[PDB]
Amino acid sequence: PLPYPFAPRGLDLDPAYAELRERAPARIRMPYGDDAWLVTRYEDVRTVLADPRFSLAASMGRDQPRMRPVARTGAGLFSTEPPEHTRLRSLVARQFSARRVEPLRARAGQLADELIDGMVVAGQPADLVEDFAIPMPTTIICEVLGIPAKDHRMLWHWAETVLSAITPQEVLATEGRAFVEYMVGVLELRGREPGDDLLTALVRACREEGLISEEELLSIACDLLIAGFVSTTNQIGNFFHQLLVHPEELTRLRERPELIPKAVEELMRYVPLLTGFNLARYATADVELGGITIRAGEAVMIATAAANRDPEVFQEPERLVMDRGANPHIGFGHGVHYCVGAHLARLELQVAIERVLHRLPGMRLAVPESELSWKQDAMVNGLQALPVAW
């Protein structure tokens, strides 16, 4: 069994994935838990994500392949399949739908401008990670959920604990307990003090309409907050890094910003974001895949970043092509667990790029590229700091 995940080298795709796609699904050994099959070929990853025989509900209570000593538990979206998953996801679908996040575009741009203001007042160099990439999406998801602004820093502390693959399990357990107690309290707060936020609407669904249990309500609230805190914070930094090291792309995006959506989709395809955050499904029946047979009860993991460079699906897959047309990337997943945050994340990435490139037409690295440091032993690829001048 191949040790997994591979040690990250920046945002580079590990060269071993090229050979992996051309063979049968490989046996992998994670740091803890069951061994598993690893699927990398685009068609094979799509099959795992669409075939109901590969189940996240079946993973609960198993010795899951994972990065941490203790296995995940829960009642929410990452733990269920239809029809239970559907009842939960329908309650969040309105707020995360493209139609309902689009009105946030102006607020997101105002926030970006405010953050860029503070970078200007503070003087060069700025750090795009601490000064922009972290605050912008964390603020937004807090506003959508109805999380009070004063708790930003406390919640980012928790996010840093979750983001480290190396967090000692006692600390992870005590901060975990306190985070859940905090969210229990917020759910009480939104029932006494309703608002036009998602957690208020989810509290109604639980405690007035009996549509979800208290366990399901708390699971969804915690899942949505954590995912919102750890995903786009790192991805914004990664996209600015790739744009800065491909400067020949910046003048088109600055002058003709209607080109930014397609570039965001290409960068979504290209960038390996999630590493330690990888869901393991368990097969509920025997399944033939890639010339091998995945037995009932065995575990399967996917590598979306590898599938996203499969030469049968993408022309010139190893090149960053910012106007790429045929781009059916799996950067947000597929099937019933397709990223519920995709429209919000997309909007944030688009706005970040539009605002920063307009406000800072001379933006460039403030250190040599060799002096950049990537986060180590993280669950998500990202930079520790991104020093820029302008």
**Interface with ligand HEM, residue 77, by CB under 6 A:** yes
Selected binder of ligand HEM within 136, 165, 227, 307 (CB under 6 A): 227
Query: How far is CA 47 from its chain centroid?
Result: 21
**Interface with ligand HEM, residue 350, by CB under 6 A:** no
Strand partners, 302: 39
Binding window for ligand HEM (CB under 6 A); candidates: 32-40, 159-167, 257-265, 339-347: 339-347
Indicate the helix (H) or strand (E) that contains 185: helix 169-192
What is the pairing mode between strands 387-389 and 281-283? unpaired
Q: Binding pattern to ligand HEM, positions 147-186, x when CB under 6 A?
A: ----------------------------------------
Shortest distance (Å) from residue 298 CB to ligand EIA: 19
Contacts with ligand EIA by CB under 6 A: the residue count is 15
Backbone angles phi, psi at 132, to 5 degrees: -145, -60
Q: Which residues of 229-249 are buried (b: 16+ CB within 10 A; e: fewer)?
A: bbbbbbbbbbbbbbbbeeeeb
- At position 215, the amino acid (one-letter code) is E
- For residue 146 the two structure tokens come to 């109805």
Selected binder of ligand EIA within 72, 100, 105, 152 (CB under 6 A): 72
What is the rounded radius of gyration, in angstroms, for the C-alpha atoms of the chain? 21
**Interface with ligand EIA, residue 336, by CB under 6 A:** no
Helix ranges restricted to H, 27-76: 42-50
* Residue 141 interacting partner from ligand EIA, ligand HEM, none (CB closer than 5 to 8 Å by kind): ligand HEM
Backbone angles phi, psi at 27, to 5 degrees: -75, 130
Selected binder of ligand HEM within 100, 333, 384, 387 (CB under 6 A): 333
Distance in angstroms (rounded) separating the CA atoms of residues 46 and 279: 15
Selected binder of ligand EIA within 46, 66, 241, 334 (CB under 6 A): 66
Q: What is the DSSP letter of 25?
A: P
**Interface with ligand EIA, residue 165, by CB under 6 A:** no
Binding to ligand HEM in span 123-142, by CB under 6 A: 141
Binding window for ligand EIA (CB under 6 A); candidates: 62-70, 87-95, 241-249, 309-317: 62-70
CB 179 within 8 A of CB 222: yes
Does the CA dihedral 119-123-124-125 come out positive or negative? Answer: negative
**Interface with ligand EIA, residue 285, by CB under 6 A:** no
Distance in angstroms (rounded) separating the CA atoms of residues 182 and 199: 14
**Interface with ligand HEM, residue 304, by CB under 6 A:** yes
Distance in angstroms (rounded) separating the CA atoms of residues 346 and 130: 20
Q: Name the residue whose CB lies closest to ligand EIA.
A: 72
Binding to ligand HEM in span 26-55, by CB under 6 A: 49
Shortest distance (Å) from residue 161 CB to ligand EIA: 8
Binding to ligand EIA in span 218-237, by CB under 6 A: 226-227, 230-231
SS3 129: helix
CB 105 within 8 A of CB 140: no
Place of tokens 């079946």: 58
Q: Binding pattern to ligand HEM, positions 239-278, x when CB under 6 A?
A: ----------------------------------x-----
Binding site for ligand EIA (CB under 6 A): 66, 68, 70-72, 78, 162, 176, 226-227, 230-231, 274, 277, 279
Binding site for ligand HEM (CB under 6 A): 49, 77-78, 89, 141, 223-224, 227-228, 231-232, 235, 273, 279, 304, 331-333, 337, 339-341, 344-345
